[PDB]
Design an enzyme around this catalytic site. Structure first.
Site, PDB file in Angstrom:
ATOM      1  N   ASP A   1      -3.056   4.401  10.720  1.00 34.19           N
ATOM      2  CA  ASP A   1      -4.103   3.772   9.921  1.00 34.19           C
ATOM      3  C   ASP A   1      -4.571   2.493  10.589  1.00 34.19           C
ATOM      4  O   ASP A   1      -3.822   1.839  11.352  1.00 34.19           O
ATOM      5  CB  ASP A   1      -3.549   3.478   8.515  1.00 34.19           C
ATOM      6  CG  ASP A   1      -3.819   4.612   7.515  1.00 34.19           C
ATOM      7  OD1 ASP A   1      -4.100   5.724   7.940  1.00 34.19           O
ATOM      8  OD2 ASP A   1      -3.709   4.352   6.297  1.00 34.19           O
TER       9      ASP A   1
ATOM     10  N   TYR B   1       0.859  -1.178   0.000  1.00 31.67           N
ATOM     11  CA  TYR B   1       0.000   0.000   0.000  1.00 31.67           C
ATOM     12  C   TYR B   1       0.916   1.256   0.000  1.00 31.67           C
ATOM     13  O   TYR B   1       0.693   2.169  -0.791  1.00 31.67           O
ATOM     14  CB  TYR B   1      -0.859   0.034   1.280  1.00 31.67           C
ATOM     15  CG  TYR B   1      -1.729   1.235   1.515  1.00 31.67           C
ATOM     16  CD1 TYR B   1      -2.796   1.532   0.655  1.00 31.67           C
ATOM     17  CD2 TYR B   1      -1.459   2.074   2.567  1.00 31.67           C
ATOM     18  CE1 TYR B   1      -3.648   2.681   0.917  1.00 31.67           C
ATOM     19  CE2 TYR B   1      -2.298   3.147   2.823  1.00 31.67           C
ATOM     20  CZ  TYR B   1      -3.330   3.439   2.021  1.00 31.67           C
ATOM     21  OH  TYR B   1      -4.105   4.551   2.204  1.00 31.67           O
TER      22      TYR B   1
ATOM     23  N   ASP C   1     -10.722   9.110   5.622  1.00 29.74           N
ATOM     24  CA  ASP C   1      -9.634   9.899   6.231  1.00 29.74           C
ATOM     25  C   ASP C   1     -10.051  10.397   7.625  1.00 29.74           C
ATOM     26  O   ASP C   1     -10.850  11.333   7.720  1.00 29.74           O
ATOM     27  CB  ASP C   1      -9.259  11.102   5.334  1.00 29.74           C
ATOM     28  CG  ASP C   1      -7.972  10.861   4.515  1.00 29.74           C
ATOM     29  OD1 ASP C   1      -7.297   9.783   4.683  1.00 29.74           O
ATOM     30  OD2 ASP C   1      -7.652  11.787   3.694  1.00 29.74           O
TER      31      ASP C   1
END
Lengths: 125, 120
Positions: B95, B14, B38
């Protein structure tokens, strides 16, 4: 909405209370009906009493806890990278999780989760 | 279960695909019913558009700690740096990826707030 400054403060209060062995100061961060998880898939502990028993267990030994990066705080949540180091059946082990807190409107944590795997459990030797 | 090795490798691909600006490379890691944030965006078309927007400025993306991978989830700390009309911004999120049984990403949420947006 909680402020990010409040949430970041709570995370610092959390880490310092871990280091102090302040059982009751940790519980004070949590809502009455919060849920805590040691790890992904672990038995969730809900409510002030289950939370105190959880943290009592976590604090069965002195913990060295270090916040290793800035807290990420936004909306009504925070995430943080850290290490927890302690004697695990008599050997010093250093576990490096990322935790996730969600907060209620009163600013108490309603949920905690610590995410870590085998590759995050280290000698420190 | 997904292996932690597979999930960590996906995090690394990624990051690499963000650095390359390779929109198809990024999209391929996700399931067709994945959701991104986000205000979530869901399904291939919306994820593609999300990332196409994310990539209008070339990104320099680096993991800054070891990936945390267990069960069917992974979390990771990293930075995303870009230049814009004379100024460098470095954003430092954490994340969270959830994976499906087939090993594709089903959800990503990037968590960062104002203090995690740095003036480069």
């Amino acid at each position: 909405m909680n402020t990010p400054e409040h949430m970041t403060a709570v995370v610092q209060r959390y880490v310092a209370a871990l280091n102090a062995g302040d059982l009751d100061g940790i519980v004070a961060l949590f809502a009455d009906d919060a849920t805590v998880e040691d790890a992904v898939g672990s038995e969730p502990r809900s409510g002030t009493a289950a939370i105190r028993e959880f943290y009592a267990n976590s604090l069965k030994l002195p913990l060295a806890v270090e916040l290793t990066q800035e807290v990420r705080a936004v909306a009504n949540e925070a995430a943080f990278a850290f290490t927890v180091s302690f004697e695990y059946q008599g050997r010093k082990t250093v576990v490096a999780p990322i935790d996730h807190f969600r907060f209620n409107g009163a600013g108490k944590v309603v949920s905690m989760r610590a995410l870590f795997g085998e590759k995050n459990i280290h000698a420190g030797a």
